Amino acid sequence: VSETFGMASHLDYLVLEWLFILLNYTNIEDFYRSCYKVLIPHLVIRSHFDEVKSIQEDWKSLLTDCFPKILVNILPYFAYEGTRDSGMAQQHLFISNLPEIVVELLMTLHEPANSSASQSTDLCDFSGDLDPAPNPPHFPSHVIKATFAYISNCHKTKLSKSPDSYQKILLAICEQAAETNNVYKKHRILKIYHLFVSLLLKDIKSGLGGAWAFVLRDVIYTLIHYINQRPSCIMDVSLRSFSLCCDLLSQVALENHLHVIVGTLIPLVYEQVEVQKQVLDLLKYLVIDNKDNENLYITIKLLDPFPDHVVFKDLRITQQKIKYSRGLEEIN
Amino acid sequence: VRSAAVTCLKNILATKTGHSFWEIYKMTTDPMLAYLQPFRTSPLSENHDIWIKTLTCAFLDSGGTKCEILQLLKPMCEVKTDFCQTVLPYLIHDILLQDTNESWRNL
Numbered sequence: 451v452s453e454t455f456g457m458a459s460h461l462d463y464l465v466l467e468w469l470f471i472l473l474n475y476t477n478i479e480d481f482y483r484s485c486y487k488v489l490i491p492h493l494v495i496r497s498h499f500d501e502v503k504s505i506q507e508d509w510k511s512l513l514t515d516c517f518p519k520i521l522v523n524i525l526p527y528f529a530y531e532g533t534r535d536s537g538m539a540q541q542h543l544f545i546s547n548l549p550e551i552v553v554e555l556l557m558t559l560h561e562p563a564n565s566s567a568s569q570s571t572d573l574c575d576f577s578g579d580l581d582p583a584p585n586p587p588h589f590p591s592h593v594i595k596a597t598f599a600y601i602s603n604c605h606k607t608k609l610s611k612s613p614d615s616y617q618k619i620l621l622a623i624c625e626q627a628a629e630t631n632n633v634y635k636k637h638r639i640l641k642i643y644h645l646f647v648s649l650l651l652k653d654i655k656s657g658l659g660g661a662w663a664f665v666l667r668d669v670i671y672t673l674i675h676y677i678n679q680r681p682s683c684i685m686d687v688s689l690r691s692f693s694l695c696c697d698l699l700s701q702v703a704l705e706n707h708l709h710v711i712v713g714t715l716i717p718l719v720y721e722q723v724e725v726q727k728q729v730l731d732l733l734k735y736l737v738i739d740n741k742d743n744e745n746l747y748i749t750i751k752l753l754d755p756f757p758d759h760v761v762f763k764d765l766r767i768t769q770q771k772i773k774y775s776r777g778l779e780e781i782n
Numbered sequence: 783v784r785s786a787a788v789t790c791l792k793n794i795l796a797t798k799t800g801h802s803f804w805e806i807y808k809m810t811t812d813p814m815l816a817y818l819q820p821f822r823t824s825p826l827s828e829n830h831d832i833w834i835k836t837l838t839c840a841f842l843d844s845g846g847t848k849c850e851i852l853q854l855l856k857p858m859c860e861v862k863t864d865f866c867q868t869v870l871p872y873l874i875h876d877i878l879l880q881d882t883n884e885s886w887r888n889l
């Protein structure tokens with residue numbers, strides 16, 4: 451009934467009743483052949499149930515895996531598991547005009563005179579009449595308006611689910627489906643998933659912003675866990691994705707640890723000028739951020755200590771001379 | 783590094799088909815930027831036409847008489863759809879340059 455107030459993705463959510471024929475009867479009204487197109491979430495839920503049953507009520511509920519034996523479409527699971535990997539839930543200085551420059555215009559009502567309108571019982575006959583009016587349905591505009599006047603790195607301050615231990619289940623079941631099968635297409639599905647994880651950025655203030663960063667960090671850790679497998683599959687695409695993530699995070703914070711861990715360059719010591727932009731963006735907001743970020747930004751100094759294959763780094767570290775302002779003097 | 787614009791980069795894989803990727807083997811030796819292109823991608827593809835003179839009044843409005851010069855993408859799309867299919871890469875890049883950057887559309 452909520453569809454009228456607010457429909458193809460509901461079939462994958464309604465197919466969970468077989469884990470029966472009600473979903474097929476409801477889908478037969480429009481098309482009974484669209485079950486393969488919306489089978490991505492069904493396969494993701496089946497993989498999650500199998501992971502929960504391999505290592506509880508989920509172990510007993512995952513016994514309905516025989517329902518997926520209708521077809522033998524195994525090749526279609528290459529671009530799948532994207533939603534399963536992205537799901538981690540079900541598993542300030544505007545008062546500097548102290549001088550008379552602000553005396554000509556209005557002033558900030560921060561003194562006790564701003565709340566000097568407590569005695570308002572005279573207009574109660576008009577306040578109560580407006581309270582029962584349609585204004586109660588729009589009163590949330592006043593409560594959803596005080597979410598401003600704050601540009602601090604709130605992300606630097608923010609146990610979501612248990613998907614880390616249940617991530618290699620499909621790999622152990624399908625002979626490294628996350629690493630070997632993903633390397634068959636030259637990490638094309640991996641790049642598509644990395645792009646789709648970032649394309650879902652709609653409300654990063656306090657909603658999906660707390661889960662998208664965690665999903666990106668988990669994906670980066672899973673991609674960096676392999677030493678030879680990831681370097682044999684793809685490295686330039688991974689470096690480009692990491693640089694894009696760093697540039698997107700620098701536009702605002704706690705996700706710098708993932709970039710620092712990916713920048714260790716144990717087997718990736720064959721970098722190029724593609725890291726100059728990241729080294730510049732890390733040094734730009736180094737001394738301007740807080741002490742926690744300034745201490746976490748020691749990745750630039752750790753990478754500067756590389757004595758081999760650092761000719762391009764020494765040539766393009768000319769922008770690092772700005773560290774002598776807030777010295778950070780040792781790096782300069 | 784753009785936001786919500788990486789979806790058009792997937793069209794490069796279709797535009798890099800064997801119809802015009804014969805020079806990729808020769809360009810991947812001397813240049814260095816081909817390392818990221820071969821990992822992202824690597825048969826052929828073709829299309830047809832409908833009309834030729836279907837851009838009488840729409841060709842003289844590339845920049846637009848009024849404001850909002852971003853309407854030039856509509857003229858490029860119209861000059862790319864109803865035209866000759868000789869340029870396979872320019873024909874395959876029509877779906878990507880529809881919502882791409884204005885600089886890329888002009889180029």
